[PDB]
C-alpha cells in the first residue's frame, strides 16, 4: 500500500530552512501566501465567510530556487502537518486504473487529517498536457487527470486540505488544471533582487562563515557576481568562497590530512570549557601563524573578481 507508506512519512515542520521572512521574490505575491496560510491555519474562518477558499496553489520556477524550502516555510507559518508524496507512487504502472485509487485513498486520508497539504514535486512530469504520449500511456494518464480534477472539484466542501504541486514551466501543465476553483493561485519565482541578494548573502556569511571575516568582503560585488544564482546557493556561497580564498597560497595535502586526523581523533574528548579557555583560543591562532593559513582581504578580493 503506497498510500499508507507515503502517509507514514508525516512530519510537523516548525523550523524551515529558509523562512518566509528570509525568502526572496515573494513581496509582489505575499498577500496570496498570507491568504493561503490563513486558510490553512483556520479553514473554518474561510468556510464561514463564504468566499471560495484556495483549493490549489502552484509554484513555478527553476530547480534549486528554494521552492521546496518555500513550501516548507509556508507549512511552518501555517503550522499544519505535511506529507511528501513523490511522483513514483502515483504512477503505479502495473494495472490500468491504480493511480485513481491511489489518489482517492490519498485524498481520503487527507480529509481524515485535514487541514493538511499534499506536497508533490515535479508535477509536470506525470500530469502534463494530454496527447504528448502516444504509446499506451494515454488511458492511464487520462484516468489520473480526470480523477484529480473531480477530486479538486469538491462541491463546496472546504475541509482545509490543500495541494501544492511543483513544476518547472507553466506551459507544460494541462489547461484543465489551469482553471481557478481547482488550482486557484499561481506563484512565479524566477530570481531575487540585488538588495535581497545582498541580505541573503550577508545572512549566509553571518551563519556559516567566520564573523571576523565578514567585513573584509565587500558583499555588493559578490552579489553582482551571483545574480543568476539561487537562495540555497546564496547560502552555500561563503564556504566555497573561503575555500577558493585558501586556494591562492601554496600548501601540501599530507600536512593538512595529518592535522585533520589529529583534530578528528582529539576533538572527540576535549571538554567544551577547555576549548572556550583562553589557552585554546590563543593556541589556534599560533597554529595558523606557524602553519601559514592567514586569510587576508586582498586574497578574497582577488578570488571574487577571479570568479564569473
Amino acid at each position: 500500500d503506497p498510500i499508507k507508506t507515503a502517509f507514514d512519512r508525516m512530519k510537523r515542520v516548525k523550523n524551515p530552512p529558509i523562512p518566509l521572512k528570509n525568502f526572496a521574490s515573494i513581496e509582489s505575491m505575499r498577500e496570496e501566501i498570507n491568504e493561503v496560510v490563513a486558510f490553512l491555519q483556520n479553514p473554518k474562518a474561510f468556510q464561514e465567510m463564504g468566499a471560495r477558499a484556495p483549493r490549489g496553489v502552484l509554484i513555478v520556477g527553476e530547480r534549486g530556487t528554494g521552492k521546496t524550502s518555500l513550501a516548507l516555510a509556508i507549512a511552518a507559518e501555517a503550522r499544519v502537518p505535511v506529507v511528501n508524496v513523490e511522483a513514483q507512487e502515483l504512477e503505479a504502472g502495473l494495472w490500468v486504473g491504480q493511480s485513481a485509487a491511489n489518489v482517492r485513498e490519498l485524498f481520503q486520508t487527507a480529509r481524515d487529517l485535514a487541514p493538511v497539504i499534499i506536497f508533490v514535486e515535479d508535477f509536470d512530469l506525470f500530469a502534463g498536457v494530454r496527447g504528448k504520449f502516444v504509446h499506451t500511456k494515454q488511458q492511464d494518464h487520462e484516468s489520473f487527470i480526470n480523477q484529480l480534477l473531480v477530486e479538486l472539484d469538491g462541491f463546496e466542501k472546504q475541509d482545509g486540505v490543500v495541494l501544492m504541486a511543483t513544476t518547472r514551466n507553466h506551459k507544460q501543465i494541462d489547461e484543465a488544471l489551469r482553471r481557478p476553483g481547482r488550482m486557484d493561485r499561481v506563484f512565479h519565482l524566477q530570481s531575487p533582487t540585488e538588495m535581497e541578494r545582498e541580505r541573503i548573502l550577508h545572512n549566509a556569511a553571518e551563519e556559516t562563515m567566520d564573523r571576523e571575516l565578514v567585513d573584509l568582503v565587500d558583499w555588493r560585488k559578490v552579489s553582482e557576481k551571483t545574480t543568476l544564482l539561487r537562495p540555497i546557493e546564496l547560502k552555500l556561497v561563503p564556504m566555497a568562497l573561503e575555500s577558493s580564498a585558501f586556494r591562492s597560497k601554496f600548501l601540501d595535502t599530507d600536512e593538512l590530512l595529518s592535522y585533520v586526523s589529529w583534530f578528528a581523533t582529539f576533538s572527540h574528548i576535549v571538554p567544551p570549557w577547555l576549548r572556550k579557555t583562553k589557552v585554546a583560543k590563543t593556541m589556534g591562532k599560533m597554529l595558523v601563524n606557524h602553519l601559514g593559513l592567514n586569510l587576508t582581504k586582498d586574497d578574497l578580493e582577488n578570488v571574487v573578481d577571479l570568479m564569473e
Partner: protein, 498 residues
C-alpha cells in the same frame, strides 16, 4: 456495464442550438421513435445507423440525449473507449449485452461516443488489435442482423471520418451520415443565451458582438467562455458579469493571460511596435483611400500575452467575400503583409530587423500562389508548386485565410520537367514583390507623421485601438512636417477619450 437507464435524460430539443440542419434531419428519427406505426403501414426501411461526425465540443452526445428525451425512450450511453480491454472477447460480450438490453425495451437508442476508438482503419502506412477487430466484427454482425421492424436505432458519434472503416459506411449498417457543423453567428448567439441563463448577467453585456467576433467556436468553448467569465468576476469580486470581465475572458482564452513586468529592452519593443503599427496603418490607409476588400484594425498591443510579445487584432469578415478572391484584393492584402517591412524601412531608414520576417515569408508565398497555383496573371503555367514552409491559420495576426487558408494548395501541384520556365516564374515573382514593395513603402513614407505619432502613442500606452488610429490619421493629414509632431509637449499623448 452500467448503461444508465434514465426515464428522463433531462435535456430536450430546446437545449440544442446551432445544429438546426442536423436536428431537422433527426426529426425523422424522433418521429420514428415516438410512433412507428405510420412508418410501418407504408413500408419504410428505417436507417440502421446514424453517424454523427463533427468537431469536438459541438454537443453530438447532447444531441442524442435530447433526441432520447423528446422521444421518451431509454438512452444507452457507453463510450468507444469502454470497449477496449486487455483480455480478448470481453468487448464483443459487452457489445452483445448492450445490444440485447436494447432489444429488451424496444424502442430504444444505442449511443457509442468516440466510435473511432473501436473502429480504427487498418492503416498500411500486442493482442489488443485482435480484440478491436473482433469487437468490430461482432458490432457489424449485430448491425447487419438487425431487423428494421423492431425500431432500435443505433447512434455513433465520431470526431474523424478518415480513420473510420468504410465497411460501416456501407448501406445497411450506417444508413444516415449527419455532419455537426460548428455553430454560426445565430447558433453561437443562442448558445450564449442558453449558457447565460445559468450565471448572473448584467445588462451591459452585448452577446451579439461576442457571437460575431468569435468564429468557429464550439459550444463547449462558449461554455468555458461563460465559466471563465464567472471565475474572473469572482476574482474581481463582481456581483455580476460585466462587459470588461467578458472581454477579459476573451483575451484570456484567445491570446492568453497577461504576464507581470516581463519586458525586454526599449529597442526590443520599438521594433515590434513599429512593425505592428505599420501593418495597421497600411490596412487603414488601404481602407481609407482605395476602398479595399480587406479587414479592419480592432486594437494593437505590445503587452506580452501567451507566447506573443506583441499583437495586432484584425476583425474577421463574412465568408461570402472569401470565395472569389480577385487580383486587386490579393494585391492589397499583400501590401498589408509588407506593411511591417515598409515601417522598418521608413522609420529606421535602412537598418531593418527580424521582427518582420514572417510577414515577408507570407508575402513571398502568396506571390507564388497568385502566380502558379491560381494562375491569376495571363502567361499560362504548366505546374504549381507546394509550399516549402507551412504555417497554420491562427489568431490576431494577419488573416491569411481569405481563400479558406494560405498555406494549403488544393492538390494543384505537379512535378516540373522544364527547368527554364522555373527561373522565369521566379523573376516574375521577384518583379511583383519588388514593385509592390516600392508601392507600399511609397504610400507609407508619404505619411511619416501619423506613423510616428501612432508608434509613440502606442509605446506610451502599451495598447492602442482602431478608433485611436483613425483619429491620429484624421488629425495628421498627409504631407505635414514631422516638426509638428516633434514640437508637441507629449508625442505619446492621446487627447481622445473613447
Amino acid at each position: 456495464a452500467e448503461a444508465r437507464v434514465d426515464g428522463s435524460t433531462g435535456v430536450k430539443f430546446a437545449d440544442v442550438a446551432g445544429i438546426d440542419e442536423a436536428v431537422d434531419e433527426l426529426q425523422e428519427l424522433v418521429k420514428y421513435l415516438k410512433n412507428p406505426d405510420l412508418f410501418d403501414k407504408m413500408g419504410i426501411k428505417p436507417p440502421h445507423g446514424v453517424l454523427l461526425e463533427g468537431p469536438p465540443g459541438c454537443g453530438k452526445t447532447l444531441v442524442a440525449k435530447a433526441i432520447a428525451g423528446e422521444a421518451g425512450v431509454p438512452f444507452y450511453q457507453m463510450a468507444g473507449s469502454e470497449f477496449v480491454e486487455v483480455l480478448v472477447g470481453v468487448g464483443s460480450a459487452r457489445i452483445r449485452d448492450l445490444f440485447k438490453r436494447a432489444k429488451v425495451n424496444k424502442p430504444s437508442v444505442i449511443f457509442i461516443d468516440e466510435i473511432d476508438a473501436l473502429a480504427t482503419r487498418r492503416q498500411g502506412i500486442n493482442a489488443a488489435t485482435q480484440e478491436r477487430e473482433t469487437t468490430l466484427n461482432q458490432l457489424l454482425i449485430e448491425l447487419d442482423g438487425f431487423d428494421t421492424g423492431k425500431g432500435v436505432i443505433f447512434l455513433g458519434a465520431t470526431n474523424r471520418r478518415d480513420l473510420l472503416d468504410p465497411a460501416l459506411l456501407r448501406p445497411g449498417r450506417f444508413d444516415r451520415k449527419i455532419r455537426v457543423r460548428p455553430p454560426n453567428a445565430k447558433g453561437r448567439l443562442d448558445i450564449l443565451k442558453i449558457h447565460a441563463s445559468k450565471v448572473k448577467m448584467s445588462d451591459s453585456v452585448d452577446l451579439s458582438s461576442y457571437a460575431s467576433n468569435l468564429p468557429g467556436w464550439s459550444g463547449a468553448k462558449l461554455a468555458q467562455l461563460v465559466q471563465e467569465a464567472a471565475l474572473v468576476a469572482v476574482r474581481k469580486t463582481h456581483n455580476s458579469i460585466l462587459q470588461s470581465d467578458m472581454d477579459d475572458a476573451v483575451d484570456r482564452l484567445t491570446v492568453g493571460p497577461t504576464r507581470i513586468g516581463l519586458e525586454l529592452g526599449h529597442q526590443g519593443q520599438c521594433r515590434r511596435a513599429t512593425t505592428e503599427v505599420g501593418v495597421a496603418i497600411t490596412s487603414h490607409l488601404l481602407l481609407r483611400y482605395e476602398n479595399a476588400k480587406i479587414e479592419r484594425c480592432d486594437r494593437v498591443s505590445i503587452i506580452p500575452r501567451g507566447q506573443t510579445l506583441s499583437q495586432v487584432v484584425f476583425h474577421r469578415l463574412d465568408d461570402e467575400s472569401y470565395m472569389f478572391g480577385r487580383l486587386p484584393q490579393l494585391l492589397h492584402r499583400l501590401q498589408v503583409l509588407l506593411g511591417g517591412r515598409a515601417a522598418e524601412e521608413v522609420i529606421y531608414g535602412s537598418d531593418t530587423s527580424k521582427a518582420s520576417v514572417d510577414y515577408l515569408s507570407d508575402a513571398s508565398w502568396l506571390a507564388r500562389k497568385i502566380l502558379t497555383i491560381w494562375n491569376l496573371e495571363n502567361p499560362m503555367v504548366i505546374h504549381g508548386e507546394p509550399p516549402p514552409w507551412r504555417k497554420r491559420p491562427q489568431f490576431v495576426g494577419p488573416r491569411l485565410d481569405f481563400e479558406g487558408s494560405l498555406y494549403d494548395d488544393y492538390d494543384l501541384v505537379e512535378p516540373p520537367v522544364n527547368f527554364n520556365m522555373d527561373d522565369e516564374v521566379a523573376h516574375r515573382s521577384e518583379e511583383l514583390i519588388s514593385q509592390m514593395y516600392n508601392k507600399t513603402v511609397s504610400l507609407l513614407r508619404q505619411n511619416q507623421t501619423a506613423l510616428l505619432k501612432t508608434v509613440k502613442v502606442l509605446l506610451n500606452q502599451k495598447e492602442i485601438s482602431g478608433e485611436a488610429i483613425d483619429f491620429i490619421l484624421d488629425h495628421y493629414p498627409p504631407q505635414t512636417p514631422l516638426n509638428s509632431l516633434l514640437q508637441e509637449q507629449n508625442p505619446g499623448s492621446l487627447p481622445f477619450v473613447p
